């Protein structure tokens, strides 16, 4: 599963975490088994304006 | 007083049941004895713990 989120909301991509992203965008089950991988994408995903 | 042995048996059983019922007021290291309070005030993984 691949998506782009704010740096603050990286914590929300975890089992049993409550946030705007967790509630209304991407939800992880508490019993989820797997690995969450996040890396900064500022250089390519941010443009001026 | 002669029937004290039969009354000791009744008293011991009543005391054991009372102790068992009273144990439901014991936190056992949890935040609260009440299950509903734990569920309402905590996220599901923390509540499960």
Q: Which of residues 1-49 of B touch A (CB under 8 A)?
A: 43-46, 48
Cβ neighbors of B39 (< 8 A, separation 6 or more) are B47
| Vertex B24: Cα angle to B19 and B39 (nearest 5) | 175
Final resolution, Å: 2.6
Answer yes or no: are the C-beta atoms of A27 and A14 closer than 8 Å: no
Environment class of residue B38 by beta-carbon count within 10 Å: exposed (0-12), middle (13-18) or buried (19+)? middle
A5: left (phi over 0), alpha (psi -120 to 50) or beta: beta
What tokens appear for B32 in the block?
């609260």
Environment class of residue A40 by beta-carbon count within 10 Å: exposed (0-12), middle (13-18) or buried (19+)? exposed
**Residue A12 DSSP SS3:** coil
Q: Which residue of B has its CA nearest to A31?
A: B45
CA distance B26 to B32: 8
Answer yes or no: are the C-beta atoms of A21 and A13 closer than 8 Å: yes
For residue A16, list chain B residues with Cβ-Cβ distance below 8 A: 43-46
């Amino acid at each position: 599963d691949s998506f782009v989120i704010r740096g603050d909301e990286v914590r929300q991509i975890a089992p049993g975490q409550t946030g705007k992203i967790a509630d209304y965008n991407y939800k992880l089950p508490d019993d989820f088994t797997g690995c969450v991988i996040a890396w900064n994408s500022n250089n390519l995903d941010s443009k001026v304006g | 007083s002669p029937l004290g042995k039969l009354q000791d048996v009744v008293n011991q059983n009543a005391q054991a049941l009372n102790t068992l019922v009273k144990q439901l007021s014991s936190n056992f290291g949890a935040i609260s004895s009440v299950l509903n309070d734990i569920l309402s005030r905590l996220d599901p993984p923390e509540a499960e713990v």
